[PDB]
């Protein structure tokens, strides 16, 4: 008659009921996700809303089951994430305005649309109309416009929304108990009770700032050696000592510097591998897809695809019956249900990617005996994180030639080794201080280290400082550049970026450590090694039972987030990033810009 | 000349749910046991006490056929020796039991789409079950040390609860049809045989 045992009762109704609502609602958001229609729109609302109006009874239910008392930790977790009051200890009409708020922002981020004044006739929107010009486009004044145009008059309609996106978000943050929103997402990696693996939520920021120091020489040579690969691309604009124009890397953003590979190749006159087209010519499907990712899980001793995955999952475009969402997801239903939603092509960017969100399910499916509450990642970071290494894994060419993509007589060599971890650099590296900067921005401006009419003033110093970037227009407070940015606009942390970044090598390095890999870290493919499946499924079963401090020692052997994984395996291309900026300057100035 | 009518049992027009679970004795006929062996179509042909090996072969007083629907990865709590929802409140095997436990899937007739709540378990007792006993009360489960008084509320739970077997469940959440065969030997004119 304890409060631990009648919890463990309470836990039990909920478990059971929350599963078939839990199902409604997904069962419902799956037949509009793929066969869009105002009336599935509203039974994917109302099955939706009543899965919410149920997790809101239960919680209130489960406040009443105090913490204090309890001490078995897995009923601990479960309550606490029942127990989350959330957007519901706010007020019943600023409740409603921040939900204005983020329906208004996230619509004026898909609807946004900008033409040029050289032709009106034609409006470009981000997706695909802008995207394509930053991702393609070599002329220097055709990505400058459509880099302002873009947050002058998209960015400046989010700039008195984010204000009091701020306001409401820190009210509800305090409220529950917490210091600022930004100390309300940091909470995903706190863990209590555990002595031996206790992590608090201040030493996230302490433990990030200190794995980033350990990357800028990394980064340093990669920014430098794209730089003066950028001055022969654009001689009158880029200067050797200053920082990189935003609007000359890649993206709309730079998140990503992948598409500048074809101005800062290392050895372009060497064969790309790029199994696009021999996937063409070999007669290759979307089931051939996913039919050949299988069989790299089944070959590390993980089980097989359930027979619904392949009834169910929409695995290409509708064919002209329906309109779907083709971003690809992995969808865990309940019920032993499974799901993949993409809308594949015959890619090689898909072929890998098949391989990511097929290693969601394999997460998915391996926590599904635990409880309700607890069918997560050990934090935001590790299902993102599984994912990668299941690509990086597939997309060596000693996978390749495997599975019989790419022609065996192949000229590997040092240098196709160096064009590919150029290629993973500019991805992978590129993205770490882009990441950072922005999260530790609004991490800044939920405490209120950074006053409103100073908003863009401090992120485009920490721009120049911390990313080397440099805007190429001034902007006043009336611009809102960072919510330009999807997960910015549309209420998602952005730090989860970064851990996964690091989380994917260590587990890379583990698993390859026991997968019998000999030579360097980045042509390991884990496939056919048993021993190290096993090694990985020891994690993916306990979910979010177990604290991710313990979680990753599981596998890695390490209680922390460690950066020598990320630096090692880049280490081929940062020592011959060393010799090719020997007479170049690493490093930037903050005092420089395009503008002058 | 009379055969046993495993038909009645096995191809029955509805089954009930485990928490009354129904049990079917059969006596003074004729058990052709090695049809069900010889037909492939059963998921689950497990003998504990009796052997599936041609054992039609002996004589039994009276034997009983149990049935009922559960889950997929809950008719691994029908076997001696499990604990479990179905095990310790729904339907409970002695640890000496003599018998075969048949199962197959019934998702082409006990799902539909919506979902099918029809068959239903019990959730909390206050005791386990002793081997071969069924209870079929509604009493209000009183969890904490207030008088639910027969209501439901705050550490007071209806004890039943509804099974969801939609089409699209996983194996392991689809509708299982069981039926048990425990055999029974007493100082008795044992009843049924079967050439
Ligand atoms: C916390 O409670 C769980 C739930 O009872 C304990 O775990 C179980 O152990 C029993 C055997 O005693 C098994 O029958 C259950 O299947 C287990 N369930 C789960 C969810 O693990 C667990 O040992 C308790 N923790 C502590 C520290 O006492
Ligand atoms: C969730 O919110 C509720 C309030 O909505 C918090 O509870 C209050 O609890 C104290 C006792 O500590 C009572 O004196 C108040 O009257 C309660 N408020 C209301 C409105 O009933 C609760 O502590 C919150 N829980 C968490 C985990 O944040
Ligand atoms: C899409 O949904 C409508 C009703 O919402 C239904 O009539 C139609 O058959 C569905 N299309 C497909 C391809 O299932
Ligand atoms: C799926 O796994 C089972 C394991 O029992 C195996 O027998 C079967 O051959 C596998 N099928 C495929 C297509 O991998
Ligand atoms: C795995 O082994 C099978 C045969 O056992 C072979 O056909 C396949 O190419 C191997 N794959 C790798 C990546 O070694
Ligand atoms: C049930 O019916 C099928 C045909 O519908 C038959 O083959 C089978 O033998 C029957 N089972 C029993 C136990 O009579
Ligand atoms: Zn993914």
């Not at chain 1, 990086?392 to 064009?419: M, R, V, W, Y």
């Amino acid at each position: 008659s304890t409060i631990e045992e009648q919890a463990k009762t309470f836990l039990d109704k909920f478990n059971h009921e929350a599963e078939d609502l839990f199902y409604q609602s997904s069962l419902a958001s799956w037949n509009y996700n793929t066969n869009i229609t105002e009336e599935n729109v509203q039974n994917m609302n109302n099955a939706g809303d009543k899965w919410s109006a149920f997790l809101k009874e239960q919680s209130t239910l489960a406040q009443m089951y105090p913490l204090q008392e309890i001490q078995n930790l897995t009923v601990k977790l479960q309550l606490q994430a029942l127990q989350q009051n959330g957007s519901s200890v706010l007020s019943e009409d600023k409740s409603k305005r921040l939900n204005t708020i983020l329906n208004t922002m996230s619509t004026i981020y898909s609807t946004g649309k900008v033409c040029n004044p050289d032709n009106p006739q034609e409006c470009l929107l981000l997706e695909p109309g802008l995207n394509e010009i930053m991702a393609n486009s070599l002329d220097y004044n055709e990505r400058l416009w459509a880099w302002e145009s873009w947050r002058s008059e998209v960015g400046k309609q989010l700039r008195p929304l984010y204000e009091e996106y701020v306001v409401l978000k820190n009210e509800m943050a305090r409220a529950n108990h917490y210091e600022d929103y930004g100390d309300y997402w940091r909470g995903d990696y706190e863990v209590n009770g555990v002595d031996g693996y206790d992590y608090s939520r201040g030493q996230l920021i302490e433990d990030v700032e200190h794995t980033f120091e350990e990357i800028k020489p990394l980064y340093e040579h990669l920014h430098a050696y794209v730089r003066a690969k950028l001055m022969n691309a654009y001689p009158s604009y880029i200067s050797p000592i200053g920082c990189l124009p935003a609007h000359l890397l890649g993206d709309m953003w730079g998140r990503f510097w992948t598409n500048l590979y074809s101005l800062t190749v290392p050895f372009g006159q060497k064969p790309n591998i790029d199994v696009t087209d021999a996937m063409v010519d070999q007669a290759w499907d979307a089931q051939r897809i996913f039919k050949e990712a299988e069989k790299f899980f089944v070959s590390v001793g993980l089980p097989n695809m359930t027979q619904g995955f392949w009834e169910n999952s929409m695995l290409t475009d509708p064919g002209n019956v329906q309109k779907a969402v083709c971003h690809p997801t992995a969808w865990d239903l309940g019920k032993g249900d499974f799901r993949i939603l993409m809308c594949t092509k015959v890619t090689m960017d898909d072929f890998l990617t098949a391989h990511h969100e097929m290693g969601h399910i394999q997460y998915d499916m391996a926590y599904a005996a635990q409880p309700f509450l607890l069918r997560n990642g050990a934090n935001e970071g590790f299902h993102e994180a599984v994912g990668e290494i299941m690509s990086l894994s597939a997309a060596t060419p000693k996978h390749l030639k495997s599975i019989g993509l790419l022609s065996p007589d192949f000229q590997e060599d040092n240098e196709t080794e160096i064009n590919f971890l150029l290629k993973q650099a500019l991805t992978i590296v590129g993205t770490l201080p882009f990441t950072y900067m922005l999260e530790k921005w609004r991490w800044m401006v939920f405490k209120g280290e950074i006053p409103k009419d100073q908003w863009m003033k401090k992120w485009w110093e920490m721009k120049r400082e911390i990313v080397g970037v440099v805007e190429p227009v001034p902007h006043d407070e009336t611009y809102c550049d960072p919510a330009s940015l999807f997960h910015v606009s549309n209420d998602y942390s952005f730090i989860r970026y970064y851990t996964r970044t690091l989380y994917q090598f260590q587990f890379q390095e583990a698993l390859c450590q026991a997968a019998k890999h000999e030579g360097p870290l980045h042509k390991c493919d884990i496939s056919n090694s048993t021993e190290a499946g096993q090694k990985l499924f020891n994690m993916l079963r306990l979910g979010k039972s177990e604290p991710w401090t313990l979680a990753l020692e599981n596998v890695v052997g390490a209680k922390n987030m460690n950066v020598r994984p990320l630096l090692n395996y880049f280490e081929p291309l940062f020592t011959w990033l060393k010799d090719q900026n020997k007479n170049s300057f690493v490093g930037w100035s903050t005092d420089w810009s395009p503008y002058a | 000349t009379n055969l046993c009518p495993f038909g009645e049992v096995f191809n029955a027009t509805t089954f009930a749910s485990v928490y009354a679970w129904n049990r079917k004795r059969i006596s003074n006929c004729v058990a052709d046991y090695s049809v069900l062996y010889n037909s492939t179509s059963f998921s689950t042909f497990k003998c504990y006490g009796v052997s599936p090996t041609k054992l039609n072969d002996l004589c039994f007083t009276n034997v009983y056929a149990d049935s009922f629907v559960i889950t997929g990865d809950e008719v691994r709590q029908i076997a001696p020796g499990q604990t479990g929802k179905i095990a310790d409140y729904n339907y409970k095997l002695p640890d000496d039991f003599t018998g075969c436990v048949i199962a197959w899937n019934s998702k082409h007739i006990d799902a539909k789409e919506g979902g099918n709540f029809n068959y239903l378990y019990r959730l909390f007792r206050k005791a386990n079950l002793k081997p071969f006993e069924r209870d079929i009360s509604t009493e209000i489960y009183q969890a904490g040390s207030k008088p639910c008084n027969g209501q439901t509320g705050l550490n007071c739970y209806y004890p039943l609860y509804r099974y969801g077997f939609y089409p699209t469940d996983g194996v392991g959440h689809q509708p299982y049809r069981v039926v048990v065969l425990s055999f029974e030997l007493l100082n008795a004119p044992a009843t049924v045989c079967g050439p």
